[PDB]
Structures are given as structure tokens and as C-alpha cells.
Structure 1
Amino acid sequence: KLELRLKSPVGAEPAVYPWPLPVYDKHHDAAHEIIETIRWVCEEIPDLKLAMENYLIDYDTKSFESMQRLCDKYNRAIDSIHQLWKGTTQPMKLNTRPSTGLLRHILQQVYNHSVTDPEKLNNYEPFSPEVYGETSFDLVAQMIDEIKMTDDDLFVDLGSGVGQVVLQVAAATNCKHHYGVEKADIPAKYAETMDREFRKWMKWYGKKHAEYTLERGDFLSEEWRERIANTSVIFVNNFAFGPEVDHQLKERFANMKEGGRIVSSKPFAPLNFRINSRNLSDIGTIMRVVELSPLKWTGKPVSYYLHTIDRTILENYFSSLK
């Protein structure tokens, strides 16, 4: 039937949209996704922005003719750019990581295409570890900015939901591998589509990401004990996990390497920890804990906390006993 098509700037399969264009939520639709996609491509390729600068128009997101018209202007401009690249003009640099602004758009696009019924993520057992909530792009970006990962680092989102934390980190850092592990059926199911849509859109934009895997599973399992021990950066949105789950996580953290880091929405050790002869076995003895600077109280997880595995604290206490 009626179709809208956007050509890829790097010659991947065109993106196809049905008419009428679908709505995602109260503030997101396919019409606007299309217009923003064109805008971001224009950001990627200055030549394209030029052509699009030359013969802007009153887009009626209501009108098919109008939307087909705008898509045509973009597709024609993409054709001419590809011809330009056949001449002397340098083509778009391949396999670079997306800009922060492009990444935000890509992840929203992937989410809207994969999470078909968002309401279904609220079907959890309340007052349980299953409680769903998403860390915002802005907080994830802060975590990336401040905890600096290198190609030596291994990153894991414990309880990864639909996987959008892991995708953002895979696109912004050069870790060897990123993992997400999610237990609940509904988000784990959506994460499978998120995985596919992300790999497809990233290829469409011609942008690179690191290796990652989104898995279904229980991060408290026997298998996961050793995986946690060998992870250098743990992200865990544990605000609603409870004391029992946190206690079990502490036990698994106590096997992590020196300099390992844990980012969480509820501290695993009090910020003002001081070693004495009664707390000698508390996880607080082997880590520093700092509250990440707030981004400029509600009831929902807002603040996040960085834990760094530092055994010199325990060592020091013993040297002082001598």
C-alpha cells in the first residue's frame, strides 16, 4: 500500500514506513521520527545539509503528499551526494561512533520500533525486585563521561530491562564486550527486538558500536558469580531490589578485582563508612563510595553512586593495629 521510504546515507536498505504513520505515545510519532532522522543525517553530512538548506518547506505531518514530498527531497539529495562521492569528494568517514545527539535519537528510534506496547513493562509484581524503571539517557551519559572505560574494560548491566543502557554504552565506549542480563519475561522479550533494531539502525546511519549481548537470566545464579567477579564495571539499578537481593550482590562484589567499579541507585556501603572491630567483614571495608554529582527528592531513583574496589582501606586498618 502507501509507503514512505528514506534512503540510507551509506547505502544500507532503505527505512520503510506505512501510511498512515503510527503513533508511539502521547509525545512520539513516526512522522516526527522521519523528520528528525532527516535532520540527523544532515548533521552527519554537511553537503546534504547544504542541499536541504536549499529548497525547507511547511511539512504537514498530517498529509501523505506532504510527507512523500519531504522524503523525496531527502532521497534526491542522498542520490546526488552518492554521485559526489564518485567524483573527488571524500565520502562519509565510516565506522565512527555516533555523536551524543545522534545516539539519543537512534536509541529513541530503536525503543519506539521495539517496545510496541510500553504499558506492558508496568505488568510487574509491585513491592518486589521485579519493579521496572529506566535510567535516563542523561544519567547513563554522565556515567560514561566520568567512569572512563578503556578497551580493557568489561561492562555489565545487572537487570538490564529492555537493554537500552547496554546499547548506549556499546555505542559510546570501546570495551571488549558489554552484557545485559534480565530475568523478567516481558522486558527480556523486548530486548531481543531492541538488539535487532539497534544493529539495523546503526548500520543504516553507518555508525560503529562495540560487541554486546543482551541475555535472559538470573544474575544471582551460580554461572553469574564468576561473571560478576571478572567484570570491571557493574551498572545496577537496585533501588527497588530490597535488602535480601542487595546482600547477595555484596557477596558477589566481594570477589571483584582491585579498581573494579559499581554504579548503582542505592549505595552498597554507607557513604560515611569507618572500619572498626565490629564491621570488619562489611563490604564497606573493601570499597570507596561516592555520590555522582547531580544533574541540574521525588520517590523515584534519582541519585547514583560510584563504588570503587579499594582494598588498601582494609590493609591500612591492619597496619594501624601494629
Structure 2
Amino acid sequence: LELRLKSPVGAEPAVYPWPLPVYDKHHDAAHEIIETIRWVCEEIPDLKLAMENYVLIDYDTKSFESMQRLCDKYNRAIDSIHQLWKGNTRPSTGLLRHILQQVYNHSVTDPEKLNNYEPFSPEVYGETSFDLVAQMIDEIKMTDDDLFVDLGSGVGQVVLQVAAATNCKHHYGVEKADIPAKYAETMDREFRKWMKWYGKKHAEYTLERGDFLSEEWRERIANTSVIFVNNFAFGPEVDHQLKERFANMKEGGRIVSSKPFAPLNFRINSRNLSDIGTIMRVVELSPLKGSWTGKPVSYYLHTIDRTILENYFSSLKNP
């Protein structure tokens, strides 16, 4: 016993076993099936016209016959549309939210294994992070000349969201811990498969297991144009090593973080010449000021700017 959903672009069908998988106490693969059908109908007008929409109103998620009828009605409407078309774009924000959740649900089957009790972690990515990352994407406006890196990428959710939305040359995720890095391999596979099923384009990306403080990563950070780092729980020792890596970045290089690497009110003088604040601008970006009705959250945008240090020396030489 199984349920099948035909791809709107002729990719291999999505195949679900029966009884349907349960994700948590209030979420299961039946709600995922209904929402997938609704998303494909909303974005394919001819499909909405062909589909007998009443089947999406009256259904029983606990009945194999009811769920099979619903899947069959959708599969028949897909077939009618493929017949009509007989005779790749980026996903919308709404579809991407659905895809990322679906990818997670098919990949992270045992979330307890993550041993993650933090507020902005993989298990709660959809609550605020998705919206804040979307706001960040609209704010930094990356181009094909950019290289994006997430330092401590978890199961790779930020990398997948950014790669689906932007045209950076490449997106990298580096994760040290065993369990999220192993789950990132499944997230990668499921993301490519589902994006192909929907017929959606994404930029190139790589999720890798590694230590972002290693020698190999020193040159890699130096060549990165956009660093994303949720450093809130890192503490001052790792934060110190990161500032050393950031100090080799190019002019205009950017760092997006959850805790600033330099004070927001940094004032260069003879006693703090050694501080990272001498070579980077720092601003707090808050969607509540940047409408937003979510949590009162912020991120920090750092921009490599060695003219801060240069102006201090020029002012001493020309008082």
C-alpha cells in the first residue's frame, strides 16, 4: 500500500508508504500531500482549472481510500495538463518555505540525535529563521560574483534557502558535528530531488563536513565575499579565532551574524588599533525597523573597510 504524486514537470513521482509517516504530534505526511497539491495548483493556473478542487475540501487523512482518491484526482488533472501542453524558475517564497519543511521532514527522521536545545536551531528553522534569512537575502543583494559561506551550517537549511533564492557563483556550508553533517547529506539529496519534482532552479551549492578554524579554511574564509555565521553561543574564544580569519578578507567582504564581532559604536584611538573594529563597519539590521509581525529579532551586518584604519593614520599625519 502506497500513495503517488505525479510531478508537474514529468520528473519521477513522489512515492509515500501507507500508513503515512508522522513527523510530530500535530504534523504528518498527509498534511504534506494536501499542501503539495495546493501549492502546485496555485502556481499552475491550468491545473487549478482541470483539478476537481472539491476533493481538497472534504478529505479524511486517516482513510487510505479518501487519501488515494485525493491523489488520483490530482494525478488525473496533471495528466490532462500534460495532454494540453503536448497538443525552470526560482521558487516563490511561499513554495520555498514548503519545500524546505518537506526536505527537513524527509531527512531529519530522528531529531533527538541533533542534541540541540538552542533557540535558532534546525528543529525550529521554519518558525523565525526562514523569515529572517528571507529578509537578509532582500537586504544583501548578492550577484554571480559572490561566494557565500555558512560557518556552522547545521543540516544546511540556510545554504539551501540562499541557493534557491540567489545567483551567487557558489554556496558553501561547513559543519563540524557528526550527526548534523550526516543529516546534511540527506538534506542535499532530498532538496535536489524535490526541486527537480517541482521543476525549480537553484544556484550551485556544497554542504561539507569540516572545522572552519582549520588551516585549509583560513584561505577559504579570506576568499569568501559573504560569510553567514550564527555565532551567538560560540563564546569569546572561538569569536577571537574568527576575527583573525575575517582580518584576511577583501575590501567590501561581508559578515552576517547573530552577535556583532565589533562594537556598533567603535571609535578608533591609539589604545584599540589592534581591534577588528578598525577594519570593519558594523550595523544592526532589524525587520521591526526595516511589514514584520514576527519575533523582535536582529542580525548584524559587518563590511570589511580598511579606510577606517587609513583615515586614522591620515588624521595623525595631517592634523
| Structure 2 length-normalised TM | 0.92
Aligned 8 A contact 1:132 1:161 in 2: no
| Deviation sequence 1:97-130 (CA, Å, 0-9, x none) | 1111110000000000000111221268999999
Query: Structure 1 residue 216: deviation in Å?
Result: 0.2
Q: Secondary structure at the match of 1:321?
A: helix
Say if 1:255 and 1:209 are closer, same or farther in 2 by CA, change over 3 A.
same
Q: Distance in 1 between matches of 2:121 and 2:270?
A: 34
Q: Is the 8 A contact 2:137 2:162 kept in 1?
A: yes
Aligned counterpart, 1:217: 210
Structure 1 residues without counterparts, runs of 5 or longer? 88-94
Does the C-alpha gap of structure 1 residues 111 and 293 become closer, same or farther in structure 2, counting only changes over 3 Å?
Answer: same
The change in CA–CA distance for 1:301 and 1:182 in structure 2 (over 3 A counts) is farther
Summarize deviations over 1:145-197 as a string: whole Å, max 9, x none.
10010000000000000001000000000001000000000100100000000
- Structure 1 contact 124–132 (Cα < 8 Å) conserved: no
Q: 1:78 to 1:133 in 2, by over 3 A?
A: closer
Moved more, 30-39 or 20-29: 20-29
> What secondary structure sits across from 2:288 in the alignment?
coil
Pairing 1:1-322 to 2, within 5 Å after superposition: 2-52=1-51, 55=54, 56-87=56-87, 95-122=88-115, 136-295=129-288, 302-322=297-317
Distance 1:216 1:293, change over 3 A: same
Structure 2: 5+ residue runs without aligned partners?
A: none
Secondary structure of the residue that 1:263 maps to in structure 2?
Answer: strand
| Distance (whole Å) between structure 2 residues aligned to residue 46 and residue 106 of structure 1 | 20
Identity, % of aligned pairs? 100
2:50–2:80: 8 Å Cα contact kept in structure 1? no
What is the rounded CA distance, in whole Å, between the counterparts of 1:262 and 1:308 in structure 2? 7
Per-residue deviation, 1:301: 10
Would the aligned equivalents of 2:50 and 2:81 in 1 still touch at CA under 8 Å? no
The 1-side partners of 2:294 and 2:259 are apart by: 13
Cα pair distance change 1:209/1:318, threshold 3 Å: same
Paired with 1:157 and 1:300, the residues of 2 have a C-alpha distance of 23
Deviates more, 1:232-241 or 1:20-29: 20-29
Paired residue secondary structure (1:235): strand
Q: Distance in 1 between matches of 2:295 and 2:210?
A: 25
Distance 1:217 1:310 in 2: 29
Partners of 2:66 and 2:122 in 1: CA distance: 48
Change (3 A) 1:19 1:130: closer
Question: How large is the RMSD of aligned CA atoms in angstroms?
Answer: 3.1
**8 A contact 2:171–2:205 mirrored in 1:** yes
Change (3 A) 1:263 1:101: same
The structure-2 alpha-carbon separation of the partners of 1:80 and 1:150, relative to structure 1 and needing over 3 Å to count, comes to same
Does the aligned pair in 1 maintain the 2:101–2:126 contact within 8 Å? no
Normalised by the length of structure 1, the TM-score is 0.91
Bigger mean CA offset, 39-48 vs 298-307: 298-307
**Bigger mean CA offset, 74-83 vs 43-52:** 43-52
Distance verdict in 2 for CA 1:228–1:294, change over 3 Å: same
Of the structure 1 ranges 143-152 and 297-306, higher mean CA displacement relative to structure 2 is found in 297-306
Is 1:170–1:178's contact at 8 Å kept on the other side of the alignment? yes
Q: Measure the CA separation in 2 of the matches of 1:102 and 1:235.
A: 23
3-state SS of the aligned residue for 1:271? coil
Aligned to 1:143, the other structure's residue is in SS state: helix
Farther-moved stretch of structure 1 (41-50 vs 117-126): 117-126
